[PDB]
Design brief:
- The structure is cut from a larger assembly and holds 8 protein chains of 8 kinds.
- By secondary structure, chain A is mainly alpha-helical.
- Chain A is built from 1 helix and no strands.
- In chain B, the strands form 2 sheets. In chain B, strands 2-1-5-4-3 form a 5-stranded mixed sheet. In chain B, strands 6, 7, 8 and 9 form a 4-stranded antiparallel sheet that branches.
- The radius of gyration of chain B is 23 Å and the shape is globular.
- Chain F has 94 residues and is of the alpha+beta class.
- Helices cover 17% and strands 17% of the residues of chain F.
- Chain F is elongated and about 60 Å long.
- Chain F starts with 18 loop residues before the first strand and ends with a helix.
- Classes of the chains: A mainly alpha (25), B alpha+beta (226), C alpha+beta (96), D mainly beta (200), E mainly alpha (150), F alpha+beta (94), G alpha+beta (91), H alpha+beta (127).
- At the D-G interface, loops of D face helix 1, strand 3 and helix 2 of G.
- Chain E binds one RNA strand of 245 nucleotides through helix 2, helix 5 and helix 6.
- Chain H: It is found in: Cytoplasm; Nucleus, Nucleolus.
- Chain H: It comes from Saccharomyces cerevisiae (strain ATCC 204508 / S288c).
Chain lengths: 25, 226, 96, 200, 150, 94, 91, 127
RNA sequence: GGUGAAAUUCUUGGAUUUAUUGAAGACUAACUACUGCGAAAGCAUUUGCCAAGGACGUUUUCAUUAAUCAAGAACGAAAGUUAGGGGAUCGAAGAUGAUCAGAUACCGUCGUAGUCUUAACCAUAAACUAUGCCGACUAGGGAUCGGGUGGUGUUUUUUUAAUGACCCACUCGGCACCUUACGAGAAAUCAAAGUCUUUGGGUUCUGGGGGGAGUAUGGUCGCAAGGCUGAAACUUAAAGGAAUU
């Protein structure tokens, strides 16, 4: 993958993890 | 695409040049050979007439044709029709424009383009925006092939160019200004006044376009076309 | 500059500050030049010009306010008009 | 009841020995004790009331009269002004851009106050609590609080009624509708969010 | 060099080797000393006194003509300014940018220059306080800076 | 590895210039980086002046020439054969 | 002693009305309650009265201006344009 | 002794325009173009179609009364091409060789003083 | 109208085109360069105002006040955010036209946010000269920018004074460039990337095989998007750099 696309993928995945985080904490 | 149009008329013969009459144009007395040309116009009817539809018109011609000589070919004079006299439309000075061939010819690289403009009102209340151009030149015995300026001589010559144009326009009429641009005496005045700052070359005035027209004054027109 | 000239006068010559003191100096004729800020009341300025014309003195206008005039003089407070009792070691009287 | 401060300018009666007091809407930069020169041959100064027929183009004016002898028609709200666009010498008429953005053509003998109406930027702070809105509307009229028609009974409002809270019919109401059916958007040419230029 | 810029140009004065000079000078030491204080009495800073005495009089430098320097002579005869001249002009320049930045706030270039000037003033003030020229508690106050320049 | 001392094209001491647009494919390129070719060609095609001269009012003497400056992107300049690749030794040639 | 670190003046509203609205009303109220100076006297004594009215306590001269600012930027630009037009026409 | 006109030969890609005009500019004579002579929609701007189009513009003008015209050959201009079309120079030869004398050729293509933006994006017309 | 070719779309309601204007916003061609300025980002119409800066000239003054920097602070492209103004072209999304086995990609026509500006945030880039800052020395050559010096030098106004613009020589600071390789480097290459096994001028920051990973968690800044600091478990014997055929 390109660096931009890999970083975008992990950023979206981080957004999803933080959205899941906000439900419990 | 003669056979590709599908919808030609969404709503659902006589040749139009039989109702058109030739009209011969004339030019100010500033230009020697008046002899402008001829133009079409719809025949004079009771609804719109021909004078009203021909009253507003600006015809563009070349100064070389007007003056007969050939050293004015790069300058084209724009004449505006404003009044008729029974099959001879009469014009007046409307502007001057340097042809694209000449303007892009003097514009070369490895030289400095000096430009300026002035908004000045004449004696006859003709608010005019006059443009001027100037290019730096390689003086004789010079070996450096750039011939650039230091941006301070440019401002100085720009100030001198502006005041020269202001002086020769404020204190004269439109007819006098037209009779002044043709001999190109303004270029001589500039090259006399800005020769102590930088040599320069191709001193010219670009456009004398009109901005505001005063009261119609059909009296001045009759003096123009004697 | 005018600010440097005023500072030199304040340092060397005799100066007085305020409006009543300026009027007193004009009355006694011990004044030569008066500098009035562009922020003083127009009535006060006009009366100052009347006194100056009666006493045959010079009038100068400071293109600022009372704060700027006080800063140029060298004081923290607000000065509306300064009367120059003695030039001292400066030249503000002879020039400008 | 008005967000624009008022200025009490008093004049001298030219025909009788008596002081006339006039109420003018205060403009930005106008202070007490200021001399206001109202008339035709005045100067282009803030607060002056020169007619629009003797001012240069691009002039910012206020309290513009629709017709001569109106004593204030347009630009009477805080922070609003009228822009002069041009003048016609023959058949004297001045062209004006109004605060709404609608082109207008008025007579050249319409007097207007030079400047910008004071109190500009008044609607830039949320009323925050209902008390501020109540106090603001009490000094104006009985138009607060306002009850939604969709929460009403079918007899008290056309949009009311039903087991749910829905309009039922289209909110857009034609211009040629009699009194009673005009509850919603009146002659709405377009609806929805205004995205892009308004093509004014 | 150029403490607060990227320049590296070298340009200064090259004094002559002759510590006893300029030979052709004929005026006395006392004559130039009373000229120094006369110029100092009319508000001229030591730099301008040397400049005026160098181009108008025959005084090449006031160190070989006299026994001391211009600032040294001013202090001895009682015409020494309270604050150093170089610091005085630096503070004068600083309040000029602050005056410029109080009306045209959107000038970020002036803000960067103002920080550079203020940093330069503080560095110079530290040396003067250390060398026991200014009061030990002397500080550069922005509000009081305009009053300090008088 | 590094190919040219001037990395993109003709830019040492500026850092940034206003970009220009290619005339062929509308590609945004820096003004220095763009390859410029000046067109001095006459308003008429090759030959055909003699046909114009016979049907020319006034003693000719017009012969206008159109002047235009064209900016080409790297992809378009190579594709249009205006700019061609060279050997390493020929690369240094100006 | 920095009783409030970010809330500032609008600590009266508490936790109500929303952070964004509190920030906007703080930004406008700071200028509304700020103290200005007379242009006719120079002393920092101009204070807001009613909406659009700015009256003082030393010089007592009252100025009409913005709702929360003694001089609107739009008003200043309009005044500059008016002065330029007057200078052009009266020359 | 010779009435004059203006050619206004608009030369671009996919189309070509020859529109004879009187000296003033209001009158319009023989606005025939190169797209109503070809049946391919790809040779509309081709030199072979401009000659056919200009063959009729020089006959209608002659029938009307116009014997000579001026020439102002132009391009699309704006911020798109700034270069003359493939068939613009062929159209000039067609009416010149049809007995219609010409003179004072001018280039009136609109050159912009850095106005608006050019379609294609920052990465170009990738094809 | 457009494309390699077509189509969507606009056209008896006159499209496209031409001529006379008007309004709106954006932008600063050609002149434009191995050219200038700025700490960097960056900055190209004219005029006026405001303050600032480098270089040069100096027989003016202070006098070692200096150089590099944890912490800390200012500025910081584009994009993005908040609330107004503005909103013409281009145009993340989206709607269609195609091409294609499939094409919500490349191509065509529309088009919202955005592109402009005001006030407040965001602190990122291939933000690169992939080369930190200060100082000293070392092979030559030419051109060029700014200032200065000299030459009855040339030209210029009143032929001839000045000044200005050019020629030659010199000097200081620059953006840089051409040829060589003492010297360095793995090589590509370098007037430094040289004066490093003959190892030492002063100072700051960063890296210790490739993935996991700039991820998880804990702090911290931010309205958010995101920024700063920042692992471990586990897995692998290879990745990676310059050149040769």
């Amino acid at each position: 993958m390109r660096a931009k696309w890999r970083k975008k993928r992990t950023r979206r995945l981080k957004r999803k993890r933080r959205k899941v985080r906000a439900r419990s904490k | 695409a003669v056979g590709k149009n599908k919808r030609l008329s969404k709503g659902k013969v006589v040749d139009p040049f039989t109702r058109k009459e030739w009209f011969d144009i004339k030019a100010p007395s500033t230009f020697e050979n008046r002899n402008v040309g001829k133009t079409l116009v719809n025949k004079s009817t009771g609804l719109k007439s021909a004078s009203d539809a021909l009253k507003g018109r600006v015809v563009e011609v070349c100064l070389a044709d007007l003056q007969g000589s050939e050293d004015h070919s790069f300058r084209k004079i724009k004449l505006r029709v404003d009044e008729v006299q029974g099959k001879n439309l009469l014009t007046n000075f409307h502007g001057m424009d340097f042809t694209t061939d000449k303007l892009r010819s003097m514009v070369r690289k490895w030289q400095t383009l000096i430009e300026a403009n002035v908004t000045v009102k004449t004696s006859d209340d003709y608010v005019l925006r006059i443009f001027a151009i100037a290019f730096t030149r390689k003086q004789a015995n010079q070996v450096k092939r750039h011939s650039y300026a230091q941006s301070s001589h440019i401002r100085a010559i720009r100030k001198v160019i502006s005041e020269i144009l202001t002086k020769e326009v404020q204190g004269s009429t439109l007819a006098q200004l037209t009779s002044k641009l043709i001999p190109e005496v303004i270029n001589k005045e500039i090259e006399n006044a800005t020769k102590d700052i930088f040599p320069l070359q191709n001193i010219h005035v670009r456009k004398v376009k009109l901005l505001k027209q005063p009261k119609f004054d059909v009296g001045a027109l009759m003096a123009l076309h004697g | 500059s005018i600010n440097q000239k005023l500072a030199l006068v304040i340092k060397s010559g005799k100066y007085t500050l305020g409006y009543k003191s300026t009027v007193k100096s004009l009355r006694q004729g011990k004044s030569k030049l008066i500098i009035i800020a562009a922020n003083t009341p127009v009535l006060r300025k006009s009366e100052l010009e009347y006194y100056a014309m009666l006493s045959k003195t010079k009038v100068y206008y400071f293109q600022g306010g009372n704060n700027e005039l006080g800063t140029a003089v060298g004081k923290l407070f607000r000065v509306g008009v300064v009367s120059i009792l003695e030039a001292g070691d400066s030249d503000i009287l002879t020039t400008l | 009841g008005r967000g624009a401060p008022l200025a009490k300018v008093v004049f001298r009666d030219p025909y009788k020995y008596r002081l006339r007091e006039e109420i003018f809407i205060a403009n930005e930069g106008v202070h007490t004790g200021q001399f206001i020169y109202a008339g035709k041959k005045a100067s282009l100064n803030v607060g002056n009331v020169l007619p629009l027929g003797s001012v240069p183009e691009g002039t910012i004016v206020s309290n513009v009269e629709e017709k001569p002898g109106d004593r204030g028609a347009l630009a009477r709200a805080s922070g609003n002004y009228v822009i002069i666009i041009g003048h016609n010498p023959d058949e004297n008429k001045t062209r004006v851009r109004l605060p709404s953005g609608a082109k207008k053509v008025i007579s050249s003998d319409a007097r207007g106050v030079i400047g910008v109406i004071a109190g500009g930027g008044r609607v830039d702070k949320p009323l925050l609590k209902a008390g501020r809105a109540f106090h603001k509307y009490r000094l104006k009229r009985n138009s607060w609080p306002k009850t939604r028609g969709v929460a009403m009974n079918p007899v008290d409002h056309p949009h009311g009624g039903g087991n749910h809270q829905h309009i039922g019919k289209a909110s857009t109401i034609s211009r040629g509708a009699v009194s009673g059916q005009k509850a919603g958007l009146i002659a709405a040419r377009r609806t929805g969010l205004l995205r892009g230029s308004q093509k004014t | 060099g150029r403490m607060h810029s990227a320049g590296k140009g070298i340009s200064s004065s090259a004094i002559p080797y002759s510590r006893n000079a300029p030979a052709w000078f004929k005026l006395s030491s006392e004559s130039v000393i009373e000229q120094i204080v006369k110029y100092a009495r009319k508000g001229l800073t030591p730099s301008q006194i040397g400049v005026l005495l160098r181009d108008a009089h025959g005084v090449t430098q006031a160190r070989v003509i006299t026994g001391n320097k211009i600032m040294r002579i001013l202090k001895s005869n009682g015409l020494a300014p309270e604050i150093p001249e170089d610091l005085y002009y630096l503070i004068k320049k600083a309040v000029s940018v602050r005056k410029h930045l109080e009306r045209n706030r959107k000038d970020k270039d002036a803000k960067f220059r103002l920080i550079l000037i203020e940093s330069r003033i503080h560095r110079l003030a530290r040396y003067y306080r250390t060398v026991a020229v200014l009061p030990p508690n002397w500080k550069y106050e922005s509000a009081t800076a305009s009053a300090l320049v008088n | 590895p590094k190919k040219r001392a001037s990395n993109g094209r003709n830019k040492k001491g500026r850092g940034h210039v206003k970009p220009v647009r290619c005339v062929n494919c509308s590609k945004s390129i820096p003004k220095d980086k763009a390859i410029k070719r000046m067109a001095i060609r006459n308003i008429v095609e090759a030959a055909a002046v003699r046909d114009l001269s016979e049907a020319s009012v006034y003693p000719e003497y017009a012969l206008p020439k159109t002047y235009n400056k064209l900016h080409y992107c790297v992809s378009c300049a190579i594709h249009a054969r205006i700019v061609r690749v060279r050997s390493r030794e020929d690369r240094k040639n100006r | 002693a920095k009783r409030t670190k970010k809330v500032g003046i609008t600590g009266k509203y508490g936790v109500r009305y929303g952070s964004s609205l509190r920030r906007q009303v703080k930004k406008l109220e700071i200028q509304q309650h700020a103290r200005y100076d007379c242009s006719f006297c120079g002393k920092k004594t101009v204070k807001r009265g009613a909406a659009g009215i700015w009256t003082c306590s030393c010089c007592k001269k009252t100025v009409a201006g913005g709702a929360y600012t003694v001089s609107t930027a739009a008003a200043a630009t309009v005044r500059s344009t008016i002065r330029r037009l007057r200078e052009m026409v009266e020359a | 002794s010779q009435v004059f006109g203006v050619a206004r030969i608009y030369a671009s890609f996919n189309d070509t325009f020859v529109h004879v005009t009187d000296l003033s500019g209001k009158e319009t004579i023989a606005r025939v173009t190169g797209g109503m002579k070809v049946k391919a929609d790809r040779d509309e701007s081709s030199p072979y179609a401009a000659m056919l189009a200009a063959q009729d513009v020089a006959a209608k003008c002659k029938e009307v009364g116009i014997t000579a015209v001026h020439v102002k050959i132009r391009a699309t201009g704006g911020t798109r091409t700034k270069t003359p079309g493939p068939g613009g120079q062929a159209a000039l030869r067609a009416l010149a060789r049809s007995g219609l004398r010409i003179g004072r050729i001018e280039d009136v293509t609109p050159v912009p003083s850095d106005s608006t933006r050019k379609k294609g994006g920052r990465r170009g017309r990738r094809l």
